Structure formats: structure tokens, C-alpha cells
Symmetry: D2
């Protein structure tokens, strides 16, 4: 009965066909492959297992490849031992990768570190554990003053709040991973650390060069530059992933919530899927129940209007994966049921009216003859109470629509005319079990128009 | 182009093919035949002339037969001389037709005069010129005391305010006139003096017995009983003619305006055509310009929301028929221009939305695939800015639709599917000159439903 | 109790104290003195009689002086005999007053006749009975070609549609009549034939020179120029009288209705009283009942939203004055009953809210502490269901408020504070019989602000 | 600039006058004394220090006593050593307080434990660390089956989801604490573990018996019974504290968020303060910045519409109290500024209109002449953009209004009339610095009515 869709990162604990089947029962809609870890063999087997489960059970799911992305990391230390940095001390980064670190200096992986930073900038190390202020940049060195005590381990992430970083759109490993995703025909690519329009285009060109022109690109917004260029990025993307955890290190902490609300709102208006991700039910890596706060955070993202919510470690490596999917579905069901429609160009006019009509006739189902995703998403924009049954002849579209809120996709052989759509949609509506004899359904399609124009709405009794 | 339709009574000055053609140019939509006068040869000729003009010019118009109706009239007087009745005097009516009248007593045409009146009732003679109060009823005599001074001529109408009168629905001449109308295939019958549901029913059974089952019945509301039973009468009728002059004699004068507003409103809700008639431009029997008051009365009837307005003597016998049609058309245009749409069943929902959609996309035209008149009338109910182009395969339906406001009917060979309707309706929309390349049109129809269900709305660019 | 106010022209049949008292009972609110007729003794007596009736009965009423105005009239004819002008013939007007007229030429009263006309202009004689087109202007002659057959009598009015006429704002007799009005302390002056701002100004400077600075000026809009400059005229005037009969001769007939609606709307927005006048119940000069049309015309004027309606000959000379007032009152009540409030400056905000508050609490009465008329008119603008009880310390203001719709004025000694107003207004509200123990009243006033600012609204239970 | 008010639990780190002054600068509005800990001397000194800081700085703050409340705790264990409970094992509670516990059995503090529980009920121990299901109740023993592994320490809290517990409204210690609060003249008492109407009444009677009739009671809703009787409890209380942490152990976890939204909504409608408390910025006990999640949780409570937010350990015992207040204020400011008004009995009519008027005139300030808190809260209900300046002669009311959102209280000597209110409020509005010359203010009060009726709204320019 839930409308919000659930993305599950699959890992060792959940990769078996047995587990995947149980995950789908519990509410999983989309499989996420986190390419920060694993090799092509492991990920290939996971894709294989899901498609076996789908083939045998007739259930639908989508597959999402989440790239590792480019990053700035610190490097190694003397004796591999942590060093204890003291507030007020001088500390230096070097772009020289050959340097082994200690309490006074460590190397970073990114050659451009000296270029992109400025005296006065803040360097955060290890998810903001240690904060430092740059006091001088000299040759290949960024000299800083440590702001807080902390322990520096080896290989830790670095964040540069408010700095535009000249890392490439794709790491070299990323480029290979994307070829793999095309080879495997994944449905979505979630691109890490997206900062500007040109990153999305570079990814679009790379997928297109390997037969991936139909793979939808979900841009992960992670830093202030991403936020600044959000509209540009949304325009070029097929969707957005809101990386709350990263944003919590990169922008003022009181802003993260409104960045999440802003981005979701704009994706709905733009008719593009949005996924709310990171720091959802993390405590369930270890515990069989989430915290009150985690429950409240998930629900408010649903109320904000996200299409989907995402599980990370709690479904890949955690001790209670099935519990975490199940309680997620419960939060989804509980929250979805109290949401109302938002009624506030030909396509917007017809779809908005179609929903308004569905509500005024207490119609449980809106049947959409979707060319691509556009038409089903144009109905979903107004948050219908009714479920969207989206008829498509395109198998990739069927998979991709799994991610949109309240959309039930249906693969069909063909629809040759508008009246055939009405005849066929009424049958498939009854067959779906989503509606019954005597219910009203509203039927949406294009007629005598190019694909991706919706110009027709029709009311039928089953 | 005006939206309000003009009914013109045709008489000796306007019956030629030459005049009818010029009447149509001036704005006439419907020819009214007043069967109070003329014989079958004269009326048949008028019907023939119009149909010739229609064939030669390709213009569409409907034909309306208006019955004389049953009436109560006074009788003859000694020496055929007017007599002066004095307020307070005794005066008696007799049902004995043989009696010649004088200052003390006159005969009436209706035997039921004694039965239907009651001591205390008011008797009005000659359009309320002389008013009388019944003081006794005895045998075949109704004794009254005169209320006001006035002069009593021969053969004058009698009105009995607030009295239920037991005249038959149809006079004997009416029954013959109606068969003539069936033989001649008129589009409308306007039945005079309708008082209750059963009157409408008796007329329908008379028509259905002579092949007139497709002739629409317009009930003329003329008295208090008619007003009391208006809902019943509307339900049974195809439309209503508001006879303001008659109502001014039967009900209190300050009520006539609201009785016209009430009746017009309810006809629109019911999707049934309404004509505002009587005392429109009567001064133009004699003069080439109407009165300020006359222009204002007509305009407020259009503003009340009438489908059509009617010319009587001013187009049948008057000295300036074309002047009267023309200035009527001018008022219709001037008043139609400032009217707005009125936005609040599957049919109701779809049609209301189609109009809302038209306005929101600035569509000049709503194209309706009408099964009978219901569907075009269902769109017209919301007073669209857009003109209604009504496709129908039935020639009688096409004629009848001429009387509905803002409706242009179009006879078509057939439409075999919904996509066929769109293809054809776009062609016909361009051909009509009513819309042009690049305009938006909204196309309304039924799909996989019984006739007289409207369940589909579709938006197209020409 | 009706809300719309009735202006009655008083003449020989209605001037006695006996009749005036009965006129007030029947619904008269304002006495109109038509200075086209009567001398100062007669009018002074009418003023005296009313004021006697007012003192004896404690009823309130206002007095309105209506000027004759400047006019253009034709002159004398040979043997004083009508002449028959034939369409197409040449006919000449001369500014030479000494000329006696005939079939070919007549004199007019206005020398400026040559100046203001132009070849091509239309000249109308005798309320548009005969229409003429100027073909040449030469010396003191305006040569025309007659457009329609008609009979030309002596001393008939001339109208020049669409022409700007350079008559003075006031005739010489008018100037004397206005001083008389100042001496007599009338409440209103209705200025005839107002055409532009400067006419209103010249009348105000004439009044202010004779102690009339507090006499409200009602501008009579009678022709096209007046309509063109309406905003200017409204700005300068205290109110507007709509002279429908005159406008029917000056502008195209289908426009008169909308000119009445436009003018009434703008008066309401401007918080300035409007009177709908001319051609109301004229048939009741002769008959004891009006026409259906007459009743409908009056009612639509109230529905348009007029403050007041006016009786002319029917109450001055007619055979049935009390009948005409009574049936007018009946129409006012019947029409006022079905009208709703019209909810959309500090004053605007407070007054609009006070009405909204009244309706939401079902308050029968809004009590206004009015500095001059502005504040009561500011409440009246929204057409409250509640009656307006207007407290004022100024006796002239009290009289003038009689003309505003739904306003009951009340003369008070004083109100020294806001809490005093509430105490007193609750007492007076009960005393008025307009509200009762337990009713809610809304009390509107200014507090710590210049007069004519309304900034305070207060709700009390009686 | 923030409107949301901040409650700070004061403890050893923050009790000095130096700290309290810095806490107020940072945004503290209300001091919370947590009587779970501390003795009357410590709490008395804290009240003394704040009142010194208030006296010296002229700043306002309120004092809130939060009772410890009645509780169910486990007791002691053999050798004071934790015992390791295994899922599936039998475990028994005994009401015998003399029993020292072990791995098989422990004593509880509440005699009624056997009575109130039923076979099948769930017993949670130590904030839900260990869950057990009751399998038998026998004499003074509740025998259970352990559901999950866990370690049992000494003296841990017990929760009984969905059980109605017959603990008293007040512990014996609570009753003494309340006398202390009266002695000290605290402004608020926050009563722990409120379950039904009768608890609020018992507290009301106890305060009244010690001169505390003016102390506002904030009911802490902590369990399912509290939720079930919420309306009853709200009715008897002056406000509500939402104890999210407790609710997270007592009710289904997906419900806690909607219980928080429900309760806040109802308190706003009821015109009673609501405080959102527990699990706000807990990580700041140890860290100088909150988490993204904690930031998001606080902001969503503000968006829900809470009057105030509360700091617990992070301001009493934590290492970074001033940081935690400051970042709280920042979240408040950032969130308050993007909230809109909610415009949707005489008092509701006038106040709702007063806010609507304030918005339509872009008024920065609504000045309220408040008798008690009622009137200022009746304005706050509609979430005005404008700040509420609440004039009161009552010093306790002034303190209590500190807790209401967007209310600036102002103690005044007296107001003798309505015009004095306007004169005085305009001065105090300018003096406050909240508005400036030329701004509009809306002024709200009662006039000629019993206290706690608001019937007057007035608009003034400064």
C-alpha cells in the first residue's frame, strides 16, 4: 500500500537469491550497487541474483549503480600510527604523494590541493573530526593552523567547505565502472560529487559512447558548489540524490534541512525522481530497531515529498537487513497514507486536471499510457491519492518507473489506438487488483501527438 | 460573432426567400411560426422558403412551431359597443355562450369557469385592465364586484391570478396544428400555457403518435401555476420559453424579474435550452429604433444567461423587421462580449474541466462529438468563452442545436473511433474559420460508453 | 426594511404636510425640488412643510435641489403650427432668435450652435424624433439634410450626440436658484447637464460664495461628454445621478445599460452616493400599477448596486403618487433581500474587515462614529447585510446620510472617547429597535487620527 | 530576531551569574530546573542567580520546575554486578523490595506491578535495552520470557508499552518539590508522566493549596495512555511538553512523529504553549557542533509549530553549553524566518482579523493589551509575521509570556482606557526598537468586556 519507493544497498549479507526475494517482500524496490567497494564479479553476481528472483517471481525492481567518485584523501603515516594534533599547532599538507606523514605533515592524493585553496579557507579532515585554517600556501604545501584537538589516522577524507574543487567529473576507476554498468544494462547511474552542469554532460557522453543513452543519471548533490549550480544540474540530470551526510560537512549545519526541502520541491516541479540518502537508519547496522530520531528523519523526508528513501550499510553489511527494510516500509506506509495531493503548457494542464478529476470522483487508479517516463511523472507531480498504473512497451522504462512514487509500471505488448488503450487499460486495471468493478479510473495518454506530450484524459467505470 | 441566438417570428413582410436570407444575415437563427394566425398553406410556404434559402446558402437554422393554446376569452356585447364598468358595481360572468353582454353581465368561452373559481378569487379582464373579485358562484354564473373603473370591449382575455385552471393542455386546433408540424418535420414545438407536468406529457404523446418523437418541446411558462410546477415542467420538457408579458398579468409585478432569473438558472443547470420572449422590442413594430428600456431589458435577459431571445410582431408584421433583427444582434454582441465563464456525474466533471482547460490555454474553440444535444449543452452550461463546434450525424439534432448559446452545429457523415474524431475535428475546426493554424482546441467526446455520456477530453494544436 | 433609498419629486398633489407624512410612511427618504417649474414661494413652502413634518414625527429626510440647467431648444413656428419635415430635404438652423420657423428653417436658443457643430455632425430634435446631418456651417446658419420624416413643433429640445457643447455650467436662473438653495439650507444640489470637471467646480464656487460649502453636489450625467469625463466629474462631485432617458438620446442605445453599470460601480468604489433616475415608473403618472418592464428596470438598477432610486412626475403631478412610492418601496425590499455583500488604505482595510466580521458573527447592525459621511460610506461600500447606524454630531451630515443605502443616521450630542462611543452606541443600538439584547454589533470609528480616517473596529454584545 | 523560544536546563556548568548572562545573550528564554537531581539549596541558588542577572540587566526570563515524577525502576543485584540475560530464558520480577537480584530474578520498586500487567504484555527494561514478554503472574511475581540478549544493571527504568499504570500523579518527593516551587514563585511546573485528566487536577489542587494558583502547569506526555487522554489533559493543563524520548520507548516508533505533530497542532488551536523536549542536541554534551540529524530534528519541530525547544544535558552538564544554545538560536532564526502565517466566537474573529490586517498593511508589530496570557496567545495562534508586543500589568504574566512564540512581553504600570492603550502602546512600540516612525502597528485589546475577551482591533501609524 506504500507509495514511497525504497532503495537498498546490497552487500554480502543480502546478495543471495533467498535474501533478495525476502527483501522485495519487505518492500525493496531498487537495488543499489555501491562501487566504492566490490569488484565486477561480486556486482555481476548481485545483478544476476536479482534478475533470477525477478524472472522466477514476476516482481519488478530497478538496478542503480552508485559510483565511488573522485575524492581528496590523506595518505599514510609513520608506523601506520595515529598522530595527535593539538589545537593551535601548525600542520601542513603536501601534494607529494611519496611523503609518509606524522604529527606535523601528511600528504594528500589531489595534486590541485595547493591551487584550489586560499589562505583563510577551512580544511576538514575525517568527516570534520579535525578542522584547520589555511595560513599559507607555498610551493606544494598548504600550511595550516589546527583548530581543534583530534587524532589523525591514515587515509581519511578531506572536505573543503565552500571551495570549488577542480577534481574531474569522473575518476579513472569511475569510467571503467560506467562501462560495466552499460554492459550490465543497469537502469540508473548515481554519479558522485556532482558540482556543475559540465559534470553531468561528461557522464552523459560517456554512457552514450557505450550504448547507455537510456540509462537515467541521478546526480548526487554533496557540497556547496553542487547547491549553487543545482538548477543547471537538475536540467541536465534525470534525477537527484540528496546526500545529507556529505552536506552536513560541507555547508552550515542549519542549512542542510532547507537544502533538502528545496531540492525535492524542485525535482517534483521538474518532473524528475529524487532520492533522499545517507544517515537514514544507520543505527540498524547494529540494532534491530531504529531510533525515534531516525524514524522521524525518514518520515519528514517523505513529507517533504521524496520519491524514494535509501538504505546504505544497514542493508548491505548490517546485522539486521530485513528488519531495516521492514521498518522502513512501515514508516513509508504510515507516512504516505496521511499525505494530500498538491494541485497548486498542454501536458501540465491535462495531467493536473486528470488528478483533480480522479479526486473529485474518488477514483482509486490513474492509468497512464506513458511514452518514456515523462507522462507518468507528470501525473505524480501533483501527489495523487490514486495509484498510477503506467503502461509502457519499453522494458527499461518499466524498470525505471519502479523508482517513482506511487507508480505501478506495467509492460504491455502494444497499444494501437486511443480506444484500444481504454479497452486494454480497463482490463489491466482489474487484473492488477488495484481497482474493482464499479470503481472509477481516469485514463491518461497522448493522441495524435509526438511522444512525451500528454493531451488526453478519459474517465471510465470498470 | 454573437453567442446568444435570435428567434424571429416570420410573417407576411418577412416570409419571402429574399427577406429570409437577409434576416439570416442580420442574425436570425430560428424561425418561429405563430399558429394564432395563418393557415397551413401560408406556414408550409414559409417552411419551404426557409429550406430553399438554407439549401442555396448552406446556412443552418431551426424551425419552431408555436401553438395558439387554450384560452379564456369574454364574448360579445350588445351592438358590439364598449361598456363602462364602474368600481364597486355588481358584474356577472356566465358560461352560457349564447348570451350577449352589457354593463351588468357577459359570457365567457370556458364552461369550467364556475368550477375552478372560488369566492374571493380575482378575475382580470383584458390584460388586467379591469379587475374583479368573485363574490358568489351560482349555477352557471360567477357574480363579482368590480374593483376598478374601465371599459369592457368584446372578446377580451381573462386571467385568474393564482388559480389552477382546468383547461385542456391542447385545444382542438392545436392538435391539428401539431400533426401539421410532424408532417412538416419542425425542430421545435412551443406549447402555450403549460401549467403542470401532465400538460407536457399529453403533448409528447400527441407528437409521438404522429412521428414527432424527435421534435423538442419548449414549454411556455405563463402563469402562477406554471411557476409553482416549474421543476416538474422542466423535467418533462426539452426547454422553456419565458413569457414575461403573461407573467406580468398573473403574478405580483415585483416577482416577474426573479421568476425570469430563477427559470433561466434552472434551465442552464438542467442542460435545457431557454428562450426569453415577449415584450422585447415591440416599439419597433412602429419605430426604426428601440427604447432605451427595451435595449436594457433584452441585455439583462442575456446577462441572466438566456440561450435565445425572441422577436414577435416586430419581425412578422412590423414596419422595420430587418432593423429589429439587426439591433437585436447588436445588443447580443455587445452583451455577450462582457460575459464570463461560470465554473461550478462523469459528464459534469469532464465538461466542466474541458472548459476550465480551454480558458487556461486560451482556446478559441471546444469541439464536441455530440450524441444528441446533451453533450453540447453540457459544455454550454459553463458559459465558455470558446465557441462550441458540435459534430453530429443527425440532421435534426444539428438544426436543434442552432438554438443553444454559442453552439455552431456541424453535420458529419460519421466518426468511427476517438482518434478519427480528433483528426476530423481538427480539419473541421480549420474549415469553420473559427480557429486557425497554431490555435489550441479542446475536443470533448464519449469513448466506450453509452450515448449521452461524455467521458473524454483532449487538447490539440491546429 | 428596505435598504435602497427613494427620492421623490414633490409637486402640487404631494406638497401638503398631510401627503408628505404619508409619503414618508410609504418609503420616501429624500424630497427633490425640480426647479424647471415652480417659484421660490412654492418651493419654500414645500421645504417648510417637510421640516414641520420632520419636527412633529421625528422622522429624518433630506432635501435635494435639482436645477433646470442650460439647454438648447428650437424656437417658434409660423402660426404656431407643426411642420412636416421630409427625409432628404434641406433644413437650416439659425442662431438669430428673431426668426419664426417653417418647413425650411427654424431658430435655436444657443448662439454657439454654429461654433460647436462640424460638418458631418448629427443634430437631433425633440428627444431624437427628427435626426439631421450638418452639411454646411455658414455665418449664423447650420445647413442640414433631414435624415427621417417627422413633425417639427415649437420649442423642442436639441441633442448633439458625441458633440462637446460649450454651454455654461449654470444658466442665469440656475445661479439664482442656487442662492435660494443656500438660503434655505438644502442638503443636496443636483446639477443638470454636467459635462466636465470645470462644471462641477464652477457650481462649487457659486455655492461657497453664498454659504453653501457644506451642500453636497450630485452631478447629473446626461450625454457622451459627461460619460467620457466621468472620472473627472466623480472626483469633483459628491455623488452622481444617472439620467438614463437623456443618455438614451445621446449615446448608442445598446450602451446605456453598461454606462449605468460602469457609473454605479465607480461611485461605490469612490464612496460617493449614486442615484438612478429618469424613466422609472412614468406609466404611474396615469396608472395605479407599473409595467412589468418598469418593475424589472428598477430592480436591475438596485441589483447594479444603486444607493437610491428616483420618482419624477409620478410623485409630483401624477394621479397615483402614494401608489408609486409604495410599489417602489415594495420593489426595493424584494430586490434588497436577495443581495449579498461584496468583500474586495487603513480605512479600506478596517471597514472591509468590519463587514466581514459582522457577517461571520451574524451581526444585524454596524455602528459607525462618522466624521462627515466618508466613514459610513466606507462601510456601505461592501454592501453589508447588517444595517448601518451612523452616529454624527452634525445635523447636515445626518440629513445627507439619508441618501446612502442601508444607512440610518443618528444625531448625537457628542462622543468624547472611544469607550464613550461603545457605551453610547450600545444604548442607541438598543433604542433604535434595530438590534436587541444578545445581538452582536460591530462598532467602527477613528481613534487618535484625523477625521475621515477609520482605524478601529470593535465587537460588542448588547 | 528569532520567534521560537529556548528552554535551557541549568546545572553545575551553567549556574553561575556569569554563565546565565551569557546564556541569555545566546538566546535562552526559560530556565528549567530538573528535580530528578539536585537539592533545594542548589535549585534555590540557581533561581537567585537568574533573578540577579535579570535585575541587573533588565532582561526577562521564565523559570520552569520539571518534576522527577513517579517511576518503575528495577533494584539491586548480587555483588552490584551486571547479569547477562539470554533470549528465551525465564526471568522474574518481584514486588518484594528486599530481594537482591541475579540472572533469574530482580525486584521492582512499584507494588502494583503484578496488578497492572497481564500475561502477554511487554516489559521493557533500561530504555528498551531488554524486552520481555510476561508469561505468568503469580502472587508477587511477574514471570517473563526474555526476548533479546542484554545486560541487566542495577536500578534501571522499566516501561510497559500500552499498559495503564496505577502510579500516583505525584510521587511523595514531587509533592515537596511543588511546595518549594510555590515558595520560590516559579512561573511553570512541568509535571512528569501525565496519564489522564485527574493527574492534572491533583497537581492543580496541590499548587492551589500553597498559593500557586497562578503557576502554569505544563503536562509532559510520555506514554500511550497520555496520548489516549491527550484532549482531556490539554483541557486541564496550561500547556504541553512533548517527551519524544519516552514516547519512543512506549509507542510504535513510526507513530512518535505524528504524535508530536498532532499534539503541537492541538495546543496551537487550544491557544496553549507547547514545548518540544528530549533528544534535541544531545551529541553536544560531548561535541562542539550538533549532527546534521539533530539540526534537522530541531528545525522540523519548529516547522510543526512548537512554541519552544528544550536543551537538557547539553546545557546542564555538557562540555559546550554556550555553543549548544547559540547553534540552537541559529536553527531557530533560520527556520522561523521562512515560516508563514496560518489564517485557516468574538475573540477568534477579532484576533484572526487583526493578524490578517497586520499582513495586508505590512505591519511589523501587533500590540496586545493582554489580561492574562489568553489574548496574546489568541494572536500567536495564527503565526503572525509581526512580533507580538504584549502589554501586561501582571508580573507573573510577563514572565510566563516569555515562553510563547514571537511574544515580547512588557510590564506596564496601568492602562485606564482604550485611547490610553493606543497612546501608550505607540510609545512603547517606538521605545522597544521593534518598530519605527511611519510603520503600521495593529493594536488589540478588550473594551467594555470581562478580562480574557478580545473585542477590539485598531490600526495606527507611529
Amino acid at each position: 500500500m506504500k507509495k514511497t519507493k525504497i532503495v537498498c544497498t546490497i552487500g554480502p549479507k543480502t546478495e543471495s537469491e533467498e535474501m533478495l526475494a525476502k527483501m522485495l517482500d519487505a518492500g525493496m524496490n531498487v537495488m543499489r550497487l555501491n562501487f566504492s567497494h566490490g569488484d565486477y564479479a561480486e556486482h555481476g553476481q548481485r545483478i544476476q541474483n536479482l534478475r533470477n528472483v525477478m524472472s522466477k517471481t514476476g516482481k519488478t525492481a530497478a538496478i542503480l549503480l552508485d559510483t565511488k567518485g573522485p575524492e581528496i584523501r590523506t595518505m599514510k603515516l609513520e608506523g601506520g600510527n595515529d598522530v595527535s594534533l593539538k589545537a593551535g599547532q601548525t600542520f601542513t599538507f603536501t601534494t607529494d604523494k611519496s611523503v609518509i606523514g606524522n604529527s606535523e605533515m601528511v600528504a594528500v592524493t589531489y595534486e590541485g590541493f595547493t591551487t584550489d585553496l586560499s589562505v583563510g579557507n577551512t580544511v576538514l579532515v575525517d568527516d570534520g573530526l579535525i578542522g584547520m585554517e589555511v595560513t599559507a600556501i607555498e610551493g606544494n604545501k598548504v600550511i595550516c593552523k589546527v583548530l581543534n584537538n583530534g587524532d589523525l589516522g591514515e587515509n581519511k577524507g578531506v572536505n573543503l567547505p565552500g571551495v570549488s574543487i577542480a577534481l574531474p567529473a569522473l575518476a579513472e576507476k569511475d569510467k571503467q565502472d560506467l562501462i560495466f554498468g552499460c554492459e550490465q544494462g543497469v537502469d540508473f547511474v548515481a554519479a558522485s560529487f556532482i558540482r556543475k552542469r559540465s559534470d553531468v554532460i561528461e557522464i552523459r557522453e560517456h554512457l552514450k559512447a557505450h550504448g547507455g543513452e537510456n540509462i537515467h543519471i541521478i546526480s548526487k548533490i554533496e557540497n556547496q558548489e553542487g547547491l549553487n549550480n543545482f538548477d543547471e544540474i537538475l536540467e541536465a540530470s534525470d534525477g537527484i540524490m540528496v546526500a545529507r551526510g556529505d552536506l552536513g560537512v560541507e555547508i552550515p549545519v542549519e542549512e542542510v534541512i532547507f537544502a533538502q526541502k528545496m531540492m525535492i520541491e524542485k525535482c517534483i516541479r521538474a518532473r524528475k525522481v529524487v532520492i533522499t540518502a545517507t544517515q537514514m537508519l544507520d543505527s540498524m547496522i547494529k540494532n534491530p530497531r531504529p531510533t525515534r530520531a531516525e524514524a522521524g528523519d525518514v518520515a519528514n523526508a517523505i513529507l517533504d515529498g521524496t520519491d524514494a528513501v535509501m538504505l546504505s550499510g544497514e542493508s548491505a553489511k548490517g546485522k539486521y537487513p530485513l528488519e531495516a527494510v521492514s521498518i522502513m516500509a512501515t514508516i513509508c506506509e504510515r507516512t504516505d497514507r496521511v499525505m494530500n495531493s498538491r494541485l497548486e503548457r498542454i501536458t501540465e494542464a491535462v495531467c493536473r486536471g486528470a488528478v483533480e478529476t480522479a479526486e473529485k470522483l474518488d477514483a482509486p487508479l490513474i492509468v497512464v499510457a506513458t511514452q518514456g517516463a515523462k507522462s507518468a511523472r507528470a501525473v505524480r507531480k501533483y501527489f495523487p491519492d490514486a495509484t498510477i498504473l503506467a503502461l509502457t512497451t519499453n522494458e527499461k522504462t518499466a524498470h525505471q518507473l519502479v523508482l517513482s512514487k506511487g507508480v505501478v509500471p506495467q509492460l504491455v505488448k502494444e497499444i494501437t489506438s486511443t480506444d484500444d488503450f481504454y479497452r486494454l487499460g480497463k482490463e489491466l486495471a482489474l487484473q492488477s487488483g488495484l481497482a474493482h468493478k464499479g470503481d472509477v479510473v481516469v485514463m491518461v495518454s497522448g493522441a495524435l501527438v509526438p511522444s512525451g506530450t500528454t493531451n488526453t484524459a478519459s474517465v471510465h467505470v470498470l
